[PDB]
Design a protein around this ligand. Sequence first.
Ligand SMILES: [Zn+2]
Ligand SMILES: [Zn+2]
Lengths: 107, 63, 64, 149, 52
Amino acid sequence: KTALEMVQAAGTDRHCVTFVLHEEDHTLGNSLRYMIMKNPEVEFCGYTTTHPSESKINLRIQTRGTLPAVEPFQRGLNELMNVCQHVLDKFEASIKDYKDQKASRNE
Amino acid sequence: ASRHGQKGILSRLWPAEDMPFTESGMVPDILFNPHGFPSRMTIGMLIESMAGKSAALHGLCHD
Amino acid sequence: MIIPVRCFTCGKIVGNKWEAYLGLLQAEYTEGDALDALGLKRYCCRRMLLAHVDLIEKLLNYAP
Amino acid sequence: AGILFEDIFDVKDIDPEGKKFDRVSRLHCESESFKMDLILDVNIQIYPVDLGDKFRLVIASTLYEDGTLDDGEYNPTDDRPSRADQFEYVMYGKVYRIEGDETSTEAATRLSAYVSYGGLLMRLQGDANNLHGFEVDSRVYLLMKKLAF
Amino acid sequence: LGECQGPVVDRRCPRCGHEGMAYHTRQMRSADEGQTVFYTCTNCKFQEKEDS
Ligand SMILES: [Zn+2]
Ligand SMILES: [Zn+2]
């Protein structure tokens, strides 16, 4: 019933793990790939969809300098939430400053 | 098929958000391979494409 | 047969623009101005209403 | 210093064979302090070179100027102040052929050096006394910087 | 009573390496696909075919 699997490199290596994100596509995995690549503790972050008939993405996160790849994945999720909350705030504050000039101009 | 004798078989129904949208806002409707042309030499599908695009943009029907 | 409710390419409701397009062509507009003045700006939306053979006024003649 | 080569060149002709790849210009040159020619491909969007432009050239084995260490792995997150990047245009690729006009002798006085910088090639022909450290499949750097006089 | 085998095209021959071969087209598949081009060299008279 869960919707994230983690597939290690050799059962012991925790730097490379390929996250299998169930019920996603290039909507999330292209913007996660954008955030995790902004982390200088990542040698390699890329994604692929497994097969278009399927509904999951593979996400290879490959960390240099002794970190597990759960930390760039969590940081790239929170660091995308903190993009979208701010985009939501500056969008709900420019719709409001447009309705407050459509109305309060000549009416 | 088309009207220039160029059969296709329907291979994959591609979801709409994945289609290459244009600069006008439009997605396409059928994607056609550029490797169906050079052995078949249907120039008439090129002129029909320009012609039908320019007829749908003007309200004309082209001869 | 009858006008589609949505344009095929992008999902714009063009299915309400068939009577108010016959009404513009009966009132002497050109088809290059009866489609812009209905708000069909993309050439996939114009295509649905310019090249439409409304083949149900010919098919209801065979009625009980 | 791991400097395998260092000289001052002067562009005399740009793409004489006429092949004209996009974003890449071929730069035939001659030298000043040695007696050598040079046939280099650049990237012309980023670092533009026109004919008549002198520029210093350095081929080194390591970029760390504090000792020859030859790491190999590219780390963007680490920057050391002992890089040899006081130059402007820096490439990286390996030497794939060296050839010369030997006649039953070793290392004749006109030796070449063919370096392939990921696809952009190079021919540094000259005396064998100036091309010692070029072994085949040695991964060397290119370092150039435009002079103005 | 009593063609220079066609027009030339600059294609290198497989055997002798001459720069120009003479060609002849012919539509040997069905109408669904293709043409077929028969090349024929000038010097060594070698004949190969392609399916487009
Ligand atoms: Zn449309
Ligand atoms: Zn021949």
